């Protein structure tokens, strides 16, 4: 896509090079910002194949409150096999935070459940946030999140949303992490009867790694073809009752998928 | 500054109108970001008288950890008057959260001092960040923490952070948090022997309230004038240790004060 492309050319062009936790090394930019309009499409990636099947399956996971592996294993996803420990757990990351923030004085909170509560009753509301940044839990999380805090946005009954992403793996992470909220945005607004308005990305550290230099120069060549179409076939009783088959993705036509090692 | 001016036309010719908690009515737009550097000068706004006492001492009480506004008072700031209760207390804002984010197994972290470990020790570190948003405490809060979420990075020798601000006034918050964040930067920097770098500003709904109008259309009339420059005159022990008459802002020629009423 046009933006992500962008994205990847300016920090080819402007990054700097920069040492990180991996050892793999990065070309690094501090601060970029970027706007989808999802009236225009489903924004996925088109210059090389994305498998749609792990974004769908890790968005209901974090919608599930689950912090296990065993659900992405039981629909072949494995794209969080290699943090996992050794009864495949990740400590309370994600989907934990969104379901079940635990407070001091012993109760869990679910952000999810007060958006929807939100988004009914306050729409105007400018407080209508949900963060996996749990400074008190980040000490037993297999890694820090990256898409740390989200803010959504009513306007002329539309739905936007805004992510702050604190780091950004450009290359692997992003194409899946765009597509994720985007289709968050989409099941938010139907289950709130709205249509969907912007998505909104706002990175931190937004990088590319050392080893990914020959793909992105590859998908650099590559023309973007038209968006494809969102189809949500049915709207269920509820945001935590998403099915993997209610959801089509219609008229997406990729160029080849491009193979590259995870920093891990 | 050409950067705020540049905000305050868009609102006012892309912004729809909103309702709002105050009952007050705003313009609002969702989703910016600006940039400023800071070896260009201190982004204090020129086109308008602001008060540096104010924003000197208000930063100074969050370092402290202070959530109740005796320490403004006896330094003669009343910003925060209008959300305290009768013992002066707005509940665990900012400063608790920054200096004494509580765990549910008993414990308080100090992100503060963590951020200076983490600059001092690992600078490439993409985990840089405090956070005021805490989920289990917002319901205690006057106010729910408008500039919620902070970045630092290293490239270079030098230092830049990143404000996710979910909510802004824009002519009577913003020239205050602007400036606010830009001190940090600067007394950060010091502590850690960095050069400054960029301080980046992400916004979710930005906002010009209805009663601002006229305010907003007399200050987009002036020009701006040249930045001042911050001297810090000596180097303290620690982040902790900053007193009001350590800081010089030299150069200082604004154009006059602008009166307008704060949205309770
Ligand atoms: N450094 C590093 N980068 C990351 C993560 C990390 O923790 N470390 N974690 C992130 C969480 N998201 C993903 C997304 C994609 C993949 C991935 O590897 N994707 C494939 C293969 C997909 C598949 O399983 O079929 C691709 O080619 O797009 C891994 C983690 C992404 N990037
Ligand atoms: N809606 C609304 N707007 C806000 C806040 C709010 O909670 N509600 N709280 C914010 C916290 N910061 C400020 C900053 C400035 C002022 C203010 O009023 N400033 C003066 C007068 C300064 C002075 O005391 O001398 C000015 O003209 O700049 C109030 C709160 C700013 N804007
Ligand atoms: C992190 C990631 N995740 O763990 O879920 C995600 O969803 N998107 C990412 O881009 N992603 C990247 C950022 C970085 O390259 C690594 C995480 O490393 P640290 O930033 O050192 O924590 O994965
Ligand atoms: C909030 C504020 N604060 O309370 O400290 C600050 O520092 N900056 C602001 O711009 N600010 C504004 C945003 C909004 O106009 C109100 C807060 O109202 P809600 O967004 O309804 O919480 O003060």
Redesign the pocket.
Known sequence: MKQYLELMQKVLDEGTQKNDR?GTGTLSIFGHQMRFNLQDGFPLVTTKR??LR?IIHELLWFLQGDTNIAYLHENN???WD??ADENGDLGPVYGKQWRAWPTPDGRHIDQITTVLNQLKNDPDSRRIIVSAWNVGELDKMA?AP?HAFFQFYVADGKLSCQLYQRSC?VF??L???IASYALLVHMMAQQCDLEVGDFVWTGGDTHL?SNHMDQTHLQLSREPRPLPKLIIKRKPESIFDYRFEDFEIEGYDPHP????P???
Chains 1, 2 share one sequence.
């Not at 998928?257 to 590259?260: E, F, L, Q, R, V």
């Open positions: 991996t994305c498998h792990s996803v494995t794209i290699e943090w890694l990256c793996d692997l992470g194409p899946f992490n790694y998928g491009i193979k590259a995870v920093a891990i």
